[PDB]
Ligand binder design. Structure first.
Ligand code: HEM
Ligand code: HEM
Ligand code: HEM
Ligand code: HEM
Ligand SMILES: C[C@H](Oc1cc2cc(C(N)=O)ccc2nc1N)c1cc(F)ccc1-n1cccn1
Ligand SMILES: C[C@H](Oc1cc2cc(C(N)=O)ccc2nc1N)c1cc(F)ccc1-n1cccn1
Lengths: 141, 146, 141, 146
């Protein structure tokens, strides 16, 4: 459950990503596939080599989905319903993988936006990514 | 924990540049702020009521330095983590009753702090090597719960 | 994220508890303290011996809070705000303990209401107790 | 896993009454229904689209019987779970890529099934003893992850 301060922190921190969206999303995926190789088993059809156009395109889609979640932070089950049907019903992603990607996104933000990644902002982003993760792994339609 | 000669070299080189006065306290402080129930274990540290109070607390900084020392001890004994952390595992299990999921959380917060300090130099291959290290440390700390 | 079917399944199974609320709540606590002794460290002031009046009284409070959560299933952050104040801000209960009590509640329901404890109902109750758990362990004031 | 002589006696007596044709399949079926992502590992079983389809699926019932056999094996080797299960842990970790949190989930679903079958006979002390057994089994299945 996000606090009002959590929502302000998430809107401000994720707002600093802006046009870097795709780059941060692609780097988080790259970090995930290298650090936790079992995550690669969900993407057998992807070219996963460094500078892969497919990972770059996917990174943009993931980051744009998070931007959409921020734009509907009080109505995420409704706003993310199609993504939930994809990850929960179709792909059957184990919830552990969402913890891994969420962690890799935080690492990416810490490395490239250090002034924004304060302890309070880190706590708010962790809660936001955990809330998005529960929505994407739940069957509620 | 198995690390390649390349990973060993990258881990050792970055570790030698770690600010020993700050990194541990920042990892512990962030654990307390990001996973607030962890504060229950540190009531003797006094004021932990705000993020600024946690991060500037001298007990958090001193204890964080000891935690960093223990991760360093892990790096010095990668082939025998369970043996190295045997007494620390018993302390966190038998005396402190810390649930083992919290060890994984601290390891990952330390990775976030290393990324925060090193920026683009904390590359995806450097991170991958550190993930093996912190997972090894967490598993070794949880081993006496069984 | 609870589905509309989840909400009705929870209303139907928990509705069969009724006057046996306190007895199921007390048994779930008893099961928890015996199976996972570290949970006793949150109750140093309690008499935790078998048939303890204190555990029985506490069991009724826990079960009545769940009945209230069922009655406000779409507004749990607001309805359970005082319980989040207590568990998240004051007692600082580690979220693992909520998984343990939730499991003990499911065991109690399986043992005493077998006709109610179908796989569909079991799934709905697990999701409901996980949602209640996140509310009680979150700082959202 | 350490069980008291009283616990060993209670665990053995209840286990001897378990319906070996049903209990395993019911635990596996409930795992698939309650934690739906686990279905990804069992695509070869065919129709798992509804709770009734899962529970009545013959592949779920046959595989569940094998899983129950492995818990039975655990109960017979409580002093050597890591050794007994070494090859089983290798299969789940290296070949199947099953995240270890799922082993804890299956153990607890099995406890729910035992409560469902035995009613008031699955007393709080009997449950406590079974929790030690299923935790031991889960830890043994996760041990080859490092
Ligand atoms: C913050 C968490 C996540 C978000 C916001 C997210 C978002 C997305 C989006 C927007 C798509 C594209 C859907 C489309 O094509 O219309 C997608 C696809 C997919 N996601 Fe996720 N995802 C997340 C986590 C995960 C995780 C943890 C995994 C597995 C490790 C995963 C596996 C997939 C796969 C396999 C696809 C299909 C890719 C393709 O064939 O093109 N996702 N995700
Ligand atoms: C996984 C990495 C961890 C490492 C390497 C670690 C390391 C240490 C070390 C070296 C000590 C000092 C022991 C002594 O003085 O004899 C210590 C103490 C302690 N640790 Fe940890 N720890 C870890 C995780 C945790 C977590 C997750 C918690 C709680 C959530 C925790 C709570 C404590 C407490 C309460 C003490 C005693 C502090 C005091 O003296 O009042 N530790 N830890
Ligand atoms: C479904 C989950 C839970 C619910 C609905 C719940 C509900 C409650 C309620 C209604 C009270 C009484 C508040 C009052 O006196 O006005 C309470 C007190 C308390 N709860 Fe929980 N609780 C839950 C889980 C837990 C867990 C997992 C723990 C720790 C293992 C815990 C520890 C406590 C403690 C220590 C108190 C204070 C008892 C006293 O001094 O009287 N609770 N809880
Ligand atoms: C923790 C308790 C568990 C036990 C005792 C257990 C036991 C077994 C046993 C005895 C086998 C047969 C081995 C063989 O003959 O080659 C097996 C196979 C397997 N297990 Fe487990 N298992 C457990 C948990 C899990 C979980 C949680 C999953 C997935 C979520 C899983 C997925 C599988 C799969 C996919 C196979 C291969 C089935 C096939 O042949 O198609 N197991 N398990
Ligand atoms: C609008 C939202 O509604 C709910 C959020 C829920 C979250 C969980 C959960 N498990 O995080 C479980 C039940 C919920 N029920 C709601 N009504 C809400 C209401 C509130 F009073 C405070 C914060 C939020 N919030 C916005 C984003 C995240 N939380
Ligand atoms: C009213 C509630 O609102 C939210 C629930 C949230 C849950 C999470 C979560 N992490 O489970 C994250 C964000 C949420 N935001 C909400 N607005 C809701 C809305 C919906 F469309 C479907 C189900 C529920 N629901 C009722 C009980 C539990 N879920």
């Amino acid at each position: 459950v996000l606090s009002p301060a959590d929502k302000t922190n998430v809107k401000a921190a994720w707002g600093k990503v802006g046009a870097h969206a795709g780059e941060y999303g692609a780097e988080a995926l790259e970090r995930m596939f290298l650090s936790f190789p079992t995550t690669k088993t969900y993407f057998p059809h992807f070219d996963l080599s460094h500078g892969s156009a497919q990972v770059k395109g996917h990174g943009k889609k993931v980051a744009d989905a998070l931007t959409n979640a921020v734009a509907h932070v009080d109505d995420m089950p409704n706003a993310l319903s199609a993504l939930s049907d994809l990850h929960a019903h179709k792909l059957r992603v184990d919830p552990v993988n969402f913890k891994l990607l969420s962690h890799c996104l935080l690492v990416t933000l810490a490395a490239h936006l250090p002034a924004e990644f304060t302890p309070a902002v880190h706590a708010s982003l962790d809660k936001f990514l955990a809330s998005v993760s529960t929505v994407l792994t739940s069957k509620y339609r | 924990v198995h690390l390649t000669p390349e990973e060993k070299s990258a881990v050792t080189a970055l570790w030698g540049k770690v600010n020993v006065d700050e990194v541990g306290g920042e990892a512990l402080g962030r654990l307390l702020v990001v996973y607030p129930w962890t504060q229950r274990f540190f009531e003797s540290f006094g004021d932990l009521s705000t993020p600024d109070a946690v991060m500037g607390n001298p007990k958090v900084k001193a204890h964080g330095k000891k935690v960093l020392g223990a991760f360093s001890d892990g790096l010095a004994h990668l082939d025998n983590l369970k043996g190295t952390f045997a007494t620390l595992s018993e302390l966190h299990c038998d005396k402190l009753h810390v649930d083992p999921e919290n060890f994984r959380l601290l390891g990952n917060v330390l990775v976030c702090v290393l990324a925060h300090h090193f920026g683009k130099e904390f590359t995806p291959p450097v991170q991958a090597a550190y993930q093996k290290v912190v997972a090894g440390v967490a598993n070794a700390l949880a081993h006496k719960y069984h």
